[PDB]
Amino acid sequence: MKTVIQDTADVYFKRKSDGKLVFTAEAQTASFSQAISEEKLRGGIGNKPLYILKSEKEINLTVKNAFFDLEWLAMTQGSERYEVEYRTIAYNPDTEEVYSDIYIQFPNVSPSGEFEMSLENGNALAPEIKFEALADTDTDEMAVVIEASRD
Amino acid sequence: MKTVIQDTADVYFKRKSDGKLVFTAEAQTASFSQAISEEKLRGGIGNKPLYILKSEKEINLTVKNAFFDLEWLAMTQGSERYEVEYRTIAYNPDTEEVYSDIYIQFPNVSPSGEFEMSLENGNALAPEIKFEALADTDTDEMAVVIEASRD
Amino acid sequence: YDYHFEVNGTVVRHKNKGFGYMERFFELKESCDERSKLSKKQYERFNALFNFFEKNGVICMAKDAGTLNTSIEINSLAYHGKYDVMKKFIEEQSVSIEDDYKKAFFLACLGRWEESYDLYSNIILNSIDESNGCVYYLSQINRYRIYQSITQAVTQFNGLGLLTFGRHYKPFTDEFLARIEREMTNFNIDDLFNGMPFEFQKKYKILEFLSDNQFLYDDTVKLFELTNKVRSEMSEGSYSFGMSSDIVVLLRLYDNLRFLYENCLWSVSFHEFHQYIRNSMSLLIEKAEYERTRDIDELGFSFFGKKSGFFMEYYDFVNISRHFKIDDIKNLERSCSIDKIRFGEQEKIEEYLVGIAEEITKQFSANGMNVVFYTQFISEAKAALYFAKYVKLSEEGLGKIVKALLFYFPERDLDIGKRYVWLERLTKCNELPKSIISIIDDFLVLQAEKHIDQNYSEVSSNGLYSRDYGALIKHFEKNFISKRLSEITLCLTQDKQKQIDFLFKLLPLLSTNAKSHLLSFKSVENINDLMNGIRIGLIDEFTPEHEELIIEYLETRKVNYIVEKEKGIQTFSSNDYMSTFGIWYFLEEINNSKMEEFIGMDDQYDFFVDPENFDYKKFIPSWLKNYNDKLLGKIAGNKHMKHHVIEVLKERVKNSNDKRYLEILMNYFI
Amino acid sequence: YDYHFEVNGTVVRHKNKGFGYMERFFELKESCDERSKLSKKQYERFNALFNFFEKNGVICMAKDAGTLNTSIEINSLAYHGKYDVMKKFIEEQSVSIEDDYKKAFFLACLGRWEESYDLYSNIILNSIDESNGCVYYLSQINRYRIYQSITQAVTQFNGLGLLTFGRHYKPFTDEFLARIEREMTNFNIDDLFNGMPFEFQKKYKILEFLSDNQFLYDDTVKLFELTNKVRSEMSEGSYSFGMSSDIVVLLRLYDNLRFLYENCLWSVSFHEFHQYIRNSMSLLIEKAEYERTRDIDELGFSFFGKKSGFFMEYYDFVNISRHFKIDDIKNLERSCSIDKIRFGEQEKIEEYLVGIAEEITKQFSANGMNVVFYTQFISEAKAALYFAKYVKLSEEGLGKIVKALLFYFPERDLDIGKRYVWLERLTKCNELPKSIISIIDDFLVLQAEKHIDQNYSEVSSNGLYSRDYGALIKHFEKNFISKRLSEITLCLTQDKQKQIDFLFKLLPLLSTNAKSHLLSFKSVENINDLMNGIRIGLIDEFTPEHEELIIEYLETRKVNYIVEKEKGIQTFSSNDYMSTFGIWYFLEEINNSKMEEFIGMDDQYDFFVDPENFDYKKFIPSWLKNYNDKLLGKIAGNKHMKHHVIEVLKERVKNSNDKRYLEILMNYFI
Secondary structure, eight states: SSSOOOOOEEEEEEHHHHHHHOOOOOOOOOEEEEEEEOOOOTTTSSSSSSOOOOOOOOEEEEOOOOOOOHHHHHHHHHOOOEEEEEEEEEOTTOOEEEEEEEEESSSSSOOOOOOOOSSEEEEEEOOEEEEEEEOSSOOSOOOEEEEEOOO | OOOOOOOOOOEEEEEETTTTTTESSSSSEEEEEEEEEOOOOOOOOOSSSOOOTOOOEEEEEEEEOOOOSHHHEEEEHHOOOOOOEEEEEEHHHHHHHHEEEEEOOOOOBBBBBBBBOOOOOOOOOOOEEEOOOOSSSSOSSEEEEEEEOOO | EEEETTTSSEEESSSSHHHHOHHHHHHHHOOGGGGGGGGGEEEEEEHHHHHHHHTTTOOGGGGOOOOOOOOOOOHHHHHHOOOHHHHHHHHSSSSSHHHHHHHHHHHHTOHHHHHHHHHHHHHHHHHHSOOHHHHHHHHHHHHHHHHHHHHHHHHHHHIIIIIHSSSSOOSSHHHHHHHHHHHTTTOTTTTTTTOOOOHHHHGGGGOOOOOOSSHHHHHHHHHHHHHHHHHHHHHTTOOHHHHHHHHHHHHHHHHHHHHHTTTTOOOGHHHHHHHHHHHHHHHHHHHHHHHHTTTOOSSHHHHHOOOOOBOOOSSSHHHHHOOOOOOHHHHTTTTTTTSOOOOOHHHHHHHHHHHHHHHHHHHSSSOOOOOHHHHHHHHHHHHHHHHHHGGGOHHHHHHHHIIOOOOOOOOSSSSSHHHOOOOOHHHHSSSSOOHHHHHHHHHHHHHHHHHSOOOOOOOSSSSSSHHHHHHHHHHOOOOOOOHHHHHHHHHHOOSEEEEEEEEHGGGGGGGGHHHHHHTTTTTOOHHHHHHHHHTTTTSSSSOOHHHHHHHHHHHHHHHHHHHHHHHHHEETTOOOOOHHHHHHHHSOOOOOGGGGGTTTHHHHHHHHOOOOTTOOGGOOOTSGGGHHHHHHHHHTTTOOOOHHHHHHHHHHHOOOOOHHHHHHHTTTTT | OEEEETTSSOOOEOSSOOOOHHHHHHHHHTHHHHHTTHHHHHHHHHHHHHHHHHHTTTOGGGOOOOOOOOOOOOOOOHHHHHHHHHHHHHOOOOHHHHOOOOOHHHHHHHHHHHHHHHHHHHHHHHHHOOHHHHHHHHHHHHHHHHHHHHHHHHHHHHIIHHHSSSSSSOOHHHHHHHHHHHHHSSTTTTTHHHHSSSHHHTTGGGGGGGTTTHHHHHHHHHHHHHHHHHHHHHHHEEOOOOTTTTTTHHHHHHHHHHHHTTOOOOGGSSHHHOOOOOOOOHHHHHHHHHHHHHHOOSSSSTTTTOOOOOOHHHHHHHHHSSSSHHHHHHHHHHHSOOGSSSOOOOTHHHHHHHHHHHHHHOOOOOOOOHHHHHHHHHHHHHHHHHHHGGGOOOOHHHHHHHHHIIIIISTOOOHHHHHHHHHHHHHTTTTHHHHHHHHHHHHHHHHHHHSSSSOOOOOEEESSHHHHHHHHHHHOOSSSOTTHHHHHHOOOOOOOOHHHHHHTTTTOOOOHHHHHHHSSOOSOOTHHHHHIIIIITSSSSSSOTTTHHHHHHHHHHHHHHHHHHHHHHOOOOOHHHHHHHHHHTTTTOOOSSSSGGGTTTTTHHHHHHHHHTSSSSSOTTTTHHHHOSHHHHHHHTTTHHHHHHHHHHHHHHHHHOOOHHHHHHHHHHO
């Protein structure tokens, strides 16, 4: 009661073209970052343009909780690029009451980490895996956010 | 023989009123730092050029050895200053020959030992000692050097 | 605990009270006449001691220490990464137990963990009947480390293998894992040194630290103490006479590497060792960066004139290529002038990188995928390629590197934008003659011909695609005609919408006949293709129909915004043109005033469309990074966008360490 | 290792293949009906377990965890630093063996190791009558630790303490030294646990790690790993949801402090422990400062849309005063902007500083001052007073701390210039009541009375004295003019000379008759009269009266320079008067043309007096640091060489992160 102040989140991953539940549950780390950069890859053009606004842009994120699933694991035991949706709860600083839920979804993702822990001491499971934000030419992609608290 | 690059230094102590001498054969760390910084007021008043530049000047040194010398240490065993005269050499990169020696002498030094070196395990001695650049109200003092390499 | 053996290579007495048996040895070493007074037996004993001490790096003592010169030389075949000579050496009949020990270490290094346990069993069973416990103890450590490796590998295989690898992989047979579990279920490590004969425990106290995990622990505590010391030193900006904190770090680092590798113990390929190596190297490069920009007040020139900048060698290249992680590399290079540090003796690093390329080609060409060796080598090769941009590389070497990178590397860990960025930074330091241009041409031909069907969907981490691939070629080469895609276009009749469009973005790389043919049956006025038509200026200036399509898209976007606001949804897209309308209206590309009807839809749209009435509190400071230089020039001429951006620069420049913001403030706004 | 217990109190299955009786106990905790399903014996054991666990804060298990608020409290009187309560508590008669152990720990905290060692021997002797094992092991470790304290203390007393103090203060009879040396001759603590009967190791195996030195090594390595993770997320603009890698650091710091404080263990007073708190705390402040200022697009504040702000509390201040140093506080101040952080719990802080002040007053009021306590109290008092900069002081509290610091603090550990620095350091965040005026006044009075001697020098490492105390008094309020203080310091029938040097010292607090006496007692002219009077009242608007003096000083420095050139000895001459003279020349304060005869001998003089013919390759970045404000603007109005200073400032600002460089470059030059 003195000073820690904790909260909670909730993490979900889906798959395209099927209602499959193959992923973990509850992110201990839930580290999130956004990266936007530019370089001299176009250091020269034929002039009189409008612009391109390249901006690269990139999103990274990781979790570790294990015990992902067993039934769908069995069914897959015998490339849609996966689908991720997020659930978080926001509180009003004036009232500290349960009133808003934050919805976050990324259509294209890629969990790409080292396939080697190589640690001397026994761990408590939790195979931490990072994720990346893909892209296609079609439209949208990255982030679609829905805001609750229609009170 | 491949790449290490090492050198050495000499440190000589002395207290006034006589030609007493302590010395360290080496000074492993020998952290040297000169700090010049200013202060906060807004006295202003237009007809007052500040010309401050806050010369002040404080010097930090470091010395380690295992020698306190045996002659008078035992005499006191059973506040006249502690001036230090650093000794060292310099080299010419074109020739890499021994041609220059450098002398650093300070005429107002007060040792500033921190009295909580007490540690957990038996170490390789190394009684780290730090000094401080003191100054009277008369003039000059501290920074004085002698340069060799006449040729 | 009678003497200290400092990292420099000197000797300091600790607890002796009688005769100094240690210093007399170096006294005999320095003396020559007194050498001959020993008998032949004692003479050969002293010669053995002399060679042992000289090879192990001890030189002299503090009272005789002067300007010392230490060095490191590793003869282990694993470190140099010549896997070919290892697979040559394994094909040889061993003669003694030590040869078997080296072979087992090799198979462990080559990733053939399976029979490595079998060879460990052989060396364990054939070694009992002899008086040398070093091999036996080392075999114990190696077999335990291998067993732990198998267990963790199986755990991560059945954990996330099916999803990261695409299909589940079972490299390890069931009977082998069952037997190893049955025989390993009751093995403890804390008692190996205690429960094994007395003679080992007296004569070989020098091998105790390898028992528990405390050896890395006692290395890391000193390493962390040095990290704190160096950080405090850069904060204070002091000087280090004699030996410094970085040379002792580097010397202990090299000594640990050499001992951990040469005596052929497997623990060199694990995460904790990776952290040790990584934090040491990161400290070294960071301090090398910091010492470059020392202010020098009154003292530096007298002692350190013509600054002896740190020279990065192949010994300093292979480690970085081996253990670092790409995330860690992009972490480190954002705080240092990584380009500035020199690179000496490029020949051996060149042969190293060429070796990586050739064995990569050999491995991926073969149908046999050794997944076990595959796991821990991707990061090695990626880090090697990442750091390969910081060295001039031979033309034949450049050809091999590019031909391996573009062709044989998997799409799994190499996105198209990823591969492009990698090759671009590689070419930053080296020229672009016909060779590497030819490999890029072959690659774009290959990827174009692979996309002929109706289901070859393409993905990229940045949506970069072959557009900028061709743009680079046009930026280096000028009259590149591309007879191959010219023929492909000549063979493109119809009903290839994906194939037509994808190559349509490669228009400048085509021939005049090819572009004339492609102009027909071309996607007429798709809005995204309007943006793509004026990407570089294909359709040079705006036509009224383009403005009508723009307003159509604006109406669709505004009705979508109304729907989203009714549903309380906010969307973020990579194809956000919202800024772009405001930008083109700002620089008079479009004279239509209908843009003001959509004020309040997008924050950047509001910022650019209406300079006079924009809410400057909604100005995100991350927008300026994605603007052109002449956009920044024109942004400093308008009075509306002037009074606030200066203050924004002023506050971020003291509240942030991002140097690009400082460059924007300094070069343009002042 | 059956279950792995988290720092937040949650538990997760680690080595359980049967019944998870943590889960059963957790579901029994929340079920009152099932609790009632136990008889009186089991109900009593259950409620004792509940009290014990809630004392350790075992809340629940992972999957049912929502928001948890673990409490932090330290009851140990030593942590609160009530020393009088300690003396009263020990003064009482002994009651129980736990009481004996606690009072021995109390003697250790107050420092009297001589008697506490004998008390530890007495309890280790008398323990057998009660058959308790934990007391035995804790007494052994305490004896080991206290022996280390004694031996290192006596060795540094023989080595360095004599030089520090000047008198060989031997705090022990040689008989006790002989006793302690004889009793412990060949004891290595590694087997201390290994030798205590088996029933203990089946009961108290947990306390094993305290034996060897690894008791700090484990947490040190883990903290270093957390620091690595924190720095990894540092420069990425990270937003970690929930329990981020930072809260765990503070949690671990608190639990380690509770473990090493509440059980009465003496490992508090060493460097190895202090490292843990200093690093964890520095990381806390670092990430707090980072969290203060960042940039977000839309969702950055959406995640964890609140911040604790690292609201510092009384516990944090006790940590501040206990486990840092003046230098470490200095790099904290240089790194982070502590001035912005919010001060919480504004009440117990003045109790703390009042306790420290009264401890100092009683320690240094009577002739009885114990060097034993002087060993350890100095650092804590220094840290508390030095950091007291940002406290919101209370009238009585501020008065108490000020006269405590001026009057009773030892003069060996701080010189007058540093007291002068520290008082402004206190007055920065608050005002100057009449109370402070009176106290600082009386300090000036009796201190001026203190140094009047024959062979005394009153040396200082900062060069500032009580005249500057009066200067700050006037700068806040000059209405008070010196009352009778100048009279008592002004009674001189010629008499000696040093009082004359401290007479012109206090010029702007003197009586009119006092300055008349000054004029009668020699005029205003001296070499140091420059930075005495031109420092305070004369300063400017006329100084041709010292033109002969500046000419003579130039002649002296000229012969000095020509001798240096002839010999090659260089020199230095820190109090660079020619610097002030060149500043006078630049600031129109000197119109004479003979200063041009002195060009080419001093770097700053050449830069100042010869704008046309000063080479610009001899640039110095240290001059960019300090500068001035109003004459900096004057020289920023330069025309001929306006760009060179701007260019060197640009080069330093791009290559250095120093914010003051940025302030100097942007405020006036821009």
